[PDB]
Short mmCIF file of all heavy atoms in Angstrom, two decimals:
data_model
loop_
_atom_site.label_atom_id
_atom_site.label_comp_id
_atom_site.label_asym_id
_atom_site.label_seq_id
_atom_site.Cartn_x
_atom_site.Cartn_y
_atom_site.Cartn_z
N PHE A 1176 -0.81 18.99 -33.52
CA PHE A 1176 -0.76 17.75 -34.42
C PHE A 1176 -2.22 17.33 -34.72
O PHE A 1176 -3.09 17.18 -33.84
CB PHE A 1176 -0.03 16.61 -33.66
CG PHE A 1176 1.47 16.89 -33.47
CD1 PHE A 1176 1.96 17.10 -32.27
CD2 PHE A 1176 2.27 17.03 -34.63
CE1 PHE A 1176 3.29 17.50 -32.09
CE2 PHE A 1176 3.62 17.26 -34.41
CZ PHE A 1176 4.20 17.49 -33.09
N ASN A 1177 -2.52 17.31 -36.05
CA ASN A 1177 -3.91 16.77 -36.53
C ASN A 1177 -4.04 15.31 -36.24
O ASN A 1177 -3.25 14.44 -36.75
CB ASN A 1177 -4.06 17.13 -37.83
CG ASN A 1177 -5.44 16.73 -38.38
OD1 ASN A 1177 -5.67 15.77 -39.17
ND2 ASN A 1177 -6.38 17.24 -37.83
N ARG A 1178 -5.01 14.89 -35.39
CA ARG A 1178 -5.25 13.52 -35.13
C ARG A 1178 -6.69 13.00 -35.63
O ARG A 1178 -6.97 11.82 -35.53
CB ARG A 1178 -5.10 13.28 -33.58
CG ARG A 1178 -3.72 13.42 -33.08
CD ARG A 1178 -3.65 13.12 -31.59
NE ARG A 1178 -2.26 13.38 -31.11
CZ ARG A 1178 -1.86 14.59 -30.72
NH1 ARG A 1178 -2.61 15.70 -30.69
NH2 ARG A 1178 -0.76 14.75 -30.08
N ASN A 1179 -7.57 13.85 -36.06
CA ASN A 1179 -8.83 13.57 -36.49
C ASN A 1179 -9.12 13.13 -37.98
O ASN A 1179 -10.14 13.12 -38.48
CB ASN A 1179 -9.85 14.69 -36.06
CG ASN A 1179 -9.53 16.06 -36.88
OD1 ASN A 1179 -8.97 15.98 -37.94
ND2 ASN A 1179 -9.83 17.11 -36.20
N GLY A 1180 -7.96 12.90 -38.66
CA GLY A 1180 -7.95 12.43 -40.07
C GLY A 1180 -8.25 13.56 -41.09
O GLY A 1180 -8.35 13.24 -42.22
N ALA A 1181 -8.20 14.82 -40.66
CA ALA A 1181 -8.33 15.90 -41.60
C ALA A 1181 -7.16 16.16 -42.51
O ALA A 1181 -7.26 16.90 -43.47
CB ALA A 1181 -8.80 17.19 -40.83
N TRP A 1182 -5.84 15.78 -42.06
CA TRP A 1182 -4.70 16.14 -42.70
C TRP A 1182 -4.65 15.52 -44.22
O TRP A 1182 -4.98 14.44 -44.45
CB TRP A 1182 -3.47 15.67 -42.00
CG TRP A 1182 -2.23 16.42 -42.43
CD1 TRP A 1182 -1.35 16.01 -43.31
CD2 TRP A 1182 -1.84 17.79 -41.99
NE1 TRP A 1182 -0.51 17.08 -43.62
CE2 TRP A 1182 -0.72 18.17 -42.76
CE3 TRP A 1182 -2.34 18.74 -41.10
CZ2 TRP A 1182 -0.07 19.42 -42.66
CZ3 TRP A 1182 -1.73 19.99 -40.92
CH2 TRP A 1182 -0.62 20.39 -41.76
N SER A 1183 -4.17 16.37 -45.14
CA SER A 1183 -3.97 15.95 -46.53
C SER A 1183 -2.42 15.91 -46.86
O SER A 1183 -1.83 16.97 -47.30
CB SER A 1183 -4.59 16.95 -47.41
OG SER A 1183 -4.51 16.59 -48.74
N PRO A 1184 -1.68 14.73 -46.58
CA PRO A 1184 -0.29 14.68 -46.74
C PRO A 1184 0.24 14.84 -48.10
O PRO A 1184 1.37 15.28 -48.25
CB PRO A 1184 0.11 13.31 -46.14
CG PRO A 1184 -1.21 12.49 -46.47
CD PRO A 1184 -2.28 13.43 -46.19
N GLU A 1185 -0.55 14.65 -49.18
CA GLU A 1185 -0.28 14.98 -50.46
C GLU A 1185 -0.18 16.46 -50.82
O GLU A 1185 0.39 16.85 -51.82
CB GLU A 1185 -1.26 14.30 -51.47
CG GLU A 1185 -2.64 14.76 -51.37
CD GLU A 1185 -3.59 14.06 -50.49
OE1 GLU A 1185 -3.14 13.52 -49.46
OE2 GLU A 1185 -4.79 13.91 -50.77
N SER A 1186 -0.74 17.34 -49.97
CA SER A 1186 -0.76 18.72 -50.09
C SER A 1186 0.21 19.46 -49.25
O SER A 1186 0.95 20.49 -49.77
CB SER A 1186 -2.17 19.45 -49.67
OG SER A 1186 -3.18 18.52 -50.35
N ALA A 1187 0.52 19.13 -48.04
CA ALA A 1187 1.29 19.79 -47.13
C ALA A 1187 1.96 18.72 -46.13
O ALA A 1187 1.38 17.81 -45.65
CB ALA A 1187 0.55 20.83 -46.27
N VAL A 1188 3.13 19.13 -45.72
CA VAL A 1188 3.90 18.59 -44.52
C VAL A 1188 3.53 19.36 -43.37
O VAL A 1188 3.25 18.73 -42.32
CB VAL A 1188 5.52 18.56 -44.82
CG1 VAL A 1188 6.21 18.14 -43.51
CG2 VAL A 1188 5.79 17.64 -45.91
N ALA A 1189 3.58 20.70 -43.34
CA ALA A 1189 3.26 21.57 -42.20
C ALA A 1189 2.81 22.96 -42.65
O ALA A 1189 3.30 23.40 -43.68
CB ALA A 1189 4.44 21.64 -41.23
N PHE A 1190 2.02 23.61 -41.83
CA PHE A 1190 1.89 25.10 -41.94
C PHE A 1190 2.59 25.85 -40.85
O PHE A 1190 2.56 25.38 -39.70
CB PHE A 1190 0.34 25.43 -41.90
CG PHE A 1190 -0.51 24.76 -43.01
CD1 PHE A 1190 -1.34 23.70 -42.64
CD2 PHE A 1190 -0.45 25.27 -44.20
CE1 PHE A 1190 -2.06 23.12 -43.60
CE2 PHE A 1190 -1.15 24.71 -45.26
CZ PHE A 1190 -1.93 23.62 -44.91
N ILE A 1191 3.16 26.90 -41.20
CA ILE A 1191 3.79 27.79 -40.25
C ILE A 1191 2.98 29.24 -40.29
O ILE A 1191 2.80 29.62 -41.47
CB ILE A 1191 5.34 28.02 -40.44
CG1 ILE A 1191 6.15 26.90 -40.11
CG2 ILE A 1191 5.83 29.22 -39.59
CD1 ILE A 1191 6.18 25.78 -41.22
N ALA A 1192 2.46 29.62 -39.23
CA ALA A 1192 1.58 30.75 -39.20
C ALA A 1192 1.85 31.69 -38.04
O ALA A 1192 2.32 31.40 -37.02
CB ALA A 1192 0.15 30.33 -39.09
N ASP A 1193 1.65 33.03 -38.22
CA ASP A 1193 1.39 33.94 -37.10
C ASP A 1193 0.00 33.75 -36.63
O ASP A 1193 -0.95 34.23 -37.24
CB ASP A 1193 1.72 35.33 -37.59
CG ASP A 1193 1.43 36.51 -36.51
OD1 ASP A 1193 0.82 36.07 -35.47
OD2 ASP A 1193 1.94 37.61 -36.74
N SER A 1194 -0.15 33.02 -35.54
CA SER A 1194 -1.43 32.68 -35.01
C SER A 1194 -2.33 33.91 -34.51
O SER A 1194 -3.50 33.79 -34.44
CB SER A 1194 -1.30 31.88 -33.78
OG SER A 1194 -0.53 32.51 -32.80
N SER A 1195 -1.82 35.18 -34.33
CA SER A 1195 -2.51 36.32 -33.99
C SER A 1195 -3.50 36.74 -35.16
O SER A 1195 -4.43 37.40 -34.99
CB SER A 1195 -1.61 37.47 -33.65
OG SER A 1195 -0.85 37.95 -34.79
N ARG A 1196 -3.13 36.27 -36.38
CA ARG A 1196 -3.87 36.66 -37.62
C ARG A 1196 -4.80 35.73 -38.17
O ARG A 1196 -5.31 35.85 -39.21
CB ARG A 1196 -2.93 37.07 -38.68
CG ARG A 1196 -1.74 38.16 -38.23
CD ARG A 1196 -2.34 39.41 -37.74
NE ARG A 1196 -3.06 40.11 -38.68
CZ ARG A 1196 -3.69 41.32 -38.63
NH1 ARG A 1196 -3.85 41.85 -37.49
NH2 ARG A 1196 -4.24 41.73 -39.66
N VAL A 1197 -5.03 34.54 -37.50
CA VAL A 1197 -6.02 33.54 -37.88
C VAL A 1197 -7.06 33.60 -36.73
O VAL A 1197 -6.69 33.32 -35.59
CB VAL A 1197 -5.41 32.15 -38.03
CG1 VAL A 1197 -6.60 31.22 -38.51
CG2 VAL A 1197 -4.31 32.11 -39.07
N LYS A 1198 -8.37 33.69 -37.11
CA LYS A 1198 -9.35 33.60 -36.04
C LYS A 1198 -10.44 32.60 -36.45
O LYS A 1198 -10.87 32.71 -37.67
CB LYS A 1198 -9.95 35.02 -35.65
CG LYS A 1198 -8.79 35.85 -35.12
CD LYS A 1198 -9.26 37.16 -34.48
CE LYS A 1198 -8.17 38.13 -34.08
NZ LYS A 1198 -7.30 37.61 -33.00
N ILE A 1199 -11.01 31.92 -35.63
CA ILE A 1199 -12.08 30.96 -35.81
C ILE A 1199 -13.29 31.38 -34.97
O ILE A 1199 -13.16 31.48 -33.85
CB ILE A 1199 -11.71 29.45 -35.42
CG1 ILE A 1199 -10.42 29.11 -36.05
CG2 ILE A 1199 -12.86 28.59 -35.85
CD1 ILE A 1199 -10.35 29.00 -37.53
N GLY A 1200 -14.39 31.81 -35.67
CA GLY A 1200 -15.60 32.20 -34.98
C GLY A 1200 -16.36 31.04 -34.74
O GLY A 1200 -16.72 30.24 -35.51
N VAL A 1201 -16.68 30.89 -33.38
CA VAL A 1201 -17.75 29.85 -32.88
C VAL A 1201 -19.05 30.51 -32.76
O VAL A 1201 -19.28 31.19 -31.76
CB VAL A 1201 -17.25 29.01 -31.64
CG1 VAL A 1201 -18.17 28.00 -31.34
CG2 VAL A 1201 -15.86 28.43 -31.99
N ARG A 1202 -19.93 30.37 -33.63
CA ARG A 1202 -21.35 30.90 -33.53
C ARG A 1202 -22.22 29.96 -32.75
O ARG A 1202 -23.01 30.57 -31.91
CB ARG A 1202 -21.82 31.28 -34.95
CG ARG A 1202 -23.21 31.78 -35.06
CD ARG A 1202 -23.45 33.07 -34.10
NE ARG A 1202 -24.82 33.35 -34.02
CZ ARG A 1202 -25.57 33.44 -32.93
NH1 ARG A 1202 -24.88 33.16 -31.74
NH2 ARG A 1202 -26.83 33.50 -32.82
N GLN A 1203 -22.10 28.75 -32.91
CA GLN A 1203 -22.90 27.78 -32.19
C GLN A 1203 -21.93 26.58 -32.03
O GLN A 1203 -21.54 25.92 -33.06
CB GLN A 1203 -24.25 27.40 -32.91
CG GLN A 1203 -24.93 26.33 -32.20
CD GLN A 1203 -26.40 26.10 -32.74
OE1 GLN A 1203 -26.58 25.74 -33.88
NE2 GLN A 1203 -27.36 26.31 -31.91
N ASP A 1204 -21.73 26.09 -30.95
CA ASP A 1204 -20.91 24.76 -30.67
C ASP A 1204 -21.72 23.65 -31.01
O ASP A 1204 -22.92 23.72 -31.25
CB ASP A 1204 -20.38 24.77 -29.31
CG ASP A 1204 -19.21 23.83 -29.02
OD1 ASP A 1204 -18.70 23.15 -30.05
OD2 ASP A 1204 -18.65 23.75 -27.92
N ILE A 1205 -21.15 22.38 -31.10
CA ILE A 1205 -21.97 21.26 -31.57
C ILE A 1205 -23.11 20.93 -30.57
O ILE A 1205 -22.94 20.74 -29.31
CB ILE A 1205 -20.90 19.95 -31.52
CG1 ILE A 1205 -19.89 20.16 -32.55
CG2 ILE A 1205 -21.77 18.65 -31.82
CD1 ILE A 1205 -18.56 19.33 -32.32
N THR A 1206 -24.29 20.87 -31.14
CA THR A 1206 -25.59 20.66 -30.43
C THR A 1206 -26.18 19.45 -31.10
O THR A 1206 -26.18 19.15 -32.18
CB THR A 1206 -26.50 21.88 -30.59
OG1 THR A 1206 -26.60 22.32 -31.87
CG2 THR A 1206 -26.02 23.12 -29.72
N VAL A 1207 -27.04 18.64 -30.26
CA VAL A 1207 -27.66 17.36 -30.46
C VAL A 1207 -29.14 17.44 -30.35
O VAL A 1207 -29.58 18.02 -29.29
CB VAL A 1207 -27.08 16.31 -29.71
CG1 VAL A 1207 -27.51 14.94 -30.20
CG2 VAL A 1207 -25.48 16.24 -29.82
N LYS A 1208 -29.87 17.03 -31.32
CA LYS A 1208 -31.37 17.02 -31.25
C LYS A 1208 -31.87 15.61 -31.58
O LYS A 1208 -31.58 15.11 -32.64
CB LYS A 1208 -31.94 18.15 -32.10
CG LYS A 1208 -33.43 18.59 -31.71
CD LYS A 1208 -34.45 17.85 -32.57
CE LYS A 1208 -35.85 18.52 -32.15
NZ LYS A 1208 -36.40 18.20 -30.79
N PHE A 1209 -32.64 14.97 -30.66
CA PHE A 1209 -33.13 13.71 -30.95
C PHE A 1209 -34.39 13.83 -31.71
O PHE A 1209 -35.39 14.53 -31.42
CB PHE A 1209 -33.43 13.08 -29.52
CG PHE A 1209 -34.10 11.77 -29.64
CD1 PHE A 1209 -33.48 10.60 -29.86
CD2 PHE A 1209 -35.49 11.68 -29.20
CE1 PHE A 1209 -34.11 9.32 -29.90
CE2 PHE A 1209 -36.22 10.42 -29.14
CZ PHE A 1209 -35.44 9.22 -29.40
N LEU A 1210 -34.51 13.09 -32.83
CA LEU A 1210 -35.66 13.09 -33.80
C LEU A 1210 -36.34 11.71 -33.79
O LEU A 1210 -35.75 10.68 -33.99
CB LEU A 1210 -35.21 13.28 -35.14
CG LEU A 1210 -34.37 14.56 -35.50
CD1 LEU A 1210 -33.86 14.55 -36.92
CD2 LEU A 1210 -35.21 15.74 -35.27
N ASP A 1211 -37.67 11.73 -33.51
CA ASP A 1211 -38.52 10.42 -33.48
C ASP A 1211 -39.63 10.62 -34.47
O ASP A 1211 -40.09 9.51 -34.84
CB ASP A 1211 -38.94 10.21 -32.08
CG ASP A 1211 -39.76 11.35 -31.35
OD1 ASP A 1211 -39.78 12.45 -31.84
OD2 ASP A 1211 -40.40 11.01 -30.31
N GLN A 1212 -40.08 11.68 -34.88
CA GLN A 1212 -41.22 11.90 -35.88
C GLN A 1212 -40.83 12.47 -37.19
O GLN A 1212 -41.66 12.40 -38.13
CB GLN A 1212 -42.24 12.81 -35.06
CG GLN A 1212 -42.88 12.26 -33.89
CD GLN A 1212 -44.18 12.88 -33.45
OE1 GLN A 1212 -45.11 12.68 -34.19
NE2 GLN A 1212 -44.21 13.65 -32.44
N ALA A 1213 -39.61 12.94 -37.34
CA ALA A 1213 -39.14 13.58 -38.60
C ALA A 1213 -39.17 12.80 -39.98
O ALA A 1213 -39.21 11.66 -39.94
CB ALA A 1213 -37.74 14.23 -38.41
#
């Protein structure tokens, strides 16, 4: 279930997928850098 507000209810009710055929590459996970001079 999408809970982060990404869902577009005007476009779709649901997707049905073979999950073996969808892959998400994570090249770098969420990283945080503090900027004080930029």
Side-chain angles (χ1 to χ4, degrees):
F1176 297 107
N1177 181 249
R1178 296 184 187 85
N1179 65 24
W1182 201 267
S1183 181
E1185 67 268 32
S1186 310
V1188 175
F1190 300 105
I1191 291 77
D1193 179 343
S1194 60
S1195 70
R1196 308 305 294 177
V1197 183
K1198 302 190 187 294
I1199 310 300
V1201 185
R1202 175 58 194 118
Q1203 177 173 61
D1204 201 359
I1205 296 156
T1206 50
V1207 186
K1208 204 265 187 290
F1209 175 79
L1210 302 176
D1211 57 345
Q1212 299 198 69

